[PDB]
Structure 1
């Protein structure tokens, strides 16, 4: 298991434009295109992302290319953020993966709520952090996806992803 396999489990893979859990146009492995309700606007973003005039449809190779870019962007975002970087630096590699997921194409509200749990993570108060995390908006929206990520933070193991 690793961050790529982890997010592949949590996001799935779809090669045609679809709507994510918030109703936003998305493609591939959870690549958010736009928050606009316009499918045309979504298609425009897709073409710009891929570098060709698509039919709202991409290949698996293209989906994986975007995915790698998005994983990179998440790590980049963490390392450039004054609140996230020290917590990330403080974590083991398994828990770092959980952070990458929480940061991966996450809403501003999700990030806001996650920030509140950062103190617990950095102190390595795992059970307390887990409880505090369950209060987050991410958990309310997708209790299952949040439960896996929280279990990863709580245990520092891949146990929540091993049956998957």
Structure 2
């Protein structure tokens, strides 16, 4: 297991524009296209992203291409965020995948806002962190995935993904 296999499981793979859990136009492996209620706006973002008129549909290779850019974007984000960097740097490789995951899902600023959980994570107070992480809209809106990510932070193993 690694970050890609992990997000591939949580995000799924769909080659036609669809709406995500929040109701936002998405494609491939959780590649958010836009927060706009307009499908044409989404379609424009799509063609811009791919570099061709996709008419709302892309290939598997294309989905994976956007996926790698996105994963990478999430990490670079963490690395450049004054609040996220120290945590990320303090964690072992398994646990940081849980952090990338959150960022991929809710954005840098979003996660950077989990002040209390971040500190507990940095402090390596695993069970306590896991409890604090769950007192969140995130956990309540996507409980099963949040449980996987949280279990990952708590144990530092890939159990929740097997």
Q: TM-score, normalised by structure 2?
A: 0.96
Given that 2:47 and 2:54 are in contact with CA atoms closer than 8 Å, whether structure 1 keeps it comes out as: yes
CA contact (8 A) 1:27 1:33 kept: yes
Per-residue deviation at 1:114?
2.9
The alpha-carbon deviation at position 47 of structure 1 amounts to 0.4
Please tell me whether the aligned partners of residues 78 and 108 of structure 2 are also in contact (alpha carbons under 8 angstroms): no
Deviation at 1:136, TM superposition (A): 1.8
Cα deviation per residue 1:87-123 (whole Å; 9 max; x = unaligned)? Answer: 0000000001000001004157842553331000000
Normalized against structure 1, the TM-score is what? 0.95
Further displaced range: 111-120 or 44-53: 111-120
Listed one character per residue, the Cα deviations across residues 51-83 of structure 1 (whole Å, up to 9, x for unaligned) are 001110000000000000000000000000000
Distance of 2:103 and 2:156 partners within structure 1: 17
Superposed displacement of residue 137, structure 1: 1.8
Q: What displacement does 1:6 show? A: 0.3
RMSD of equivalent CA atoms: 1.3
Q: Which runs of 4+ in 1 moved over 4 A?
A: 107-110
1:138 Cα deviation after fit: 1.1
- Name structure 1 gaps, 5 residues minimum: none
- Measure the CA separation in 2 of the matches of 1:64 and 1:77: 19
User: As a proportion of its length, which structure holds more helix?
Assistant: 2
Judge conservation of contact 1:110–1:136 (CA < 8 Å) in 2.
no
Find the counterpart in structure 1 of residue 138 from structure 2: 138
Task: Give the stretch that moved more between structures: 103-112 or 22-31.
Answer: 103-112
